[PDB]
């Protein structure tokens, strides 16, 4: 599935991911795109703070969803 991640600058990155992907996995993908270290990445989805060991599906993250780096 496809999701979007908004960096702190409003930049939009596109990610190809799976429902069982962990935030840590996503976090790894963001690092590759922008060079942003995972430990400095904080992801939020629909007002929910996302934990590294949980999956996208665990947060009801669906196709075309948008995540925010904070
Ligand atoms: Zn897909
Ligand atoms: Zn994956």
Author numbering: 1 to 70
Cite, word for word, the article reporting this structure:
In rod-PEG-ub we find—for several instances of well-isolated regions of the spectrum—three peaks per residue. This peak multiplicity is in good agreement with the number of non-equivalent molecules in the asymmetric unit of the crystals, i.e. one (MPD-ub), two (cubic-PEG-ub) and three (rod-PEG-ub), respectively. Owing to the higher spectral complexity arising from the three non-equivalent molecules, we did not assign the spectra of rod-PEG-ub. The Wilson B-factor in cubic-PEG-ub is almost fourfold higher than in MPD-ub and the resolution is significantly lower, which we propose to arise from differences in the respective rocking dynamics. This correlation between NMR 15N R1ρ relaxation data and XRD resolution is further substantiated by the third crystal form, rod-PEG-ub, which displays lower 15N R1ρ rates, suggesting that rocking motions are of low amplitude (blue bars in Fig. 3b). Clearly, the rocking motion found in the MD simulation of cubic-PEG-ub (order parameters 0.982 and 0.957 for chains A and B, respectively) is much more pronounced than for MPD-ub and rod-PEG-ub (average order parameter 0.995 for both systems). Nevertheless, despite all these shortcomings, our MD simulations clearly reproduce the same trend as has been observed experimentally and thus confirm that MPD-ub and rod-PEG-ub form stable crystal arrangements, whereas cubic-PEG-ub is prone to rocking. A direct influence on rocking of the precipitating agent used for crystallization can be excluded on the basis that both cubic-PEG-ub and rod-PEG-ub crystals crystallize in essentially the same condition (sometimes even in the same crystallization drop). In our case, the packing density is indeed lowest for the crystal with the most pronounced rocking motion, with solvent content Vs of 58% for cubic-PEG-ub, 49% for MPD-ub and 40% for rod-PEG-ub, respectively.
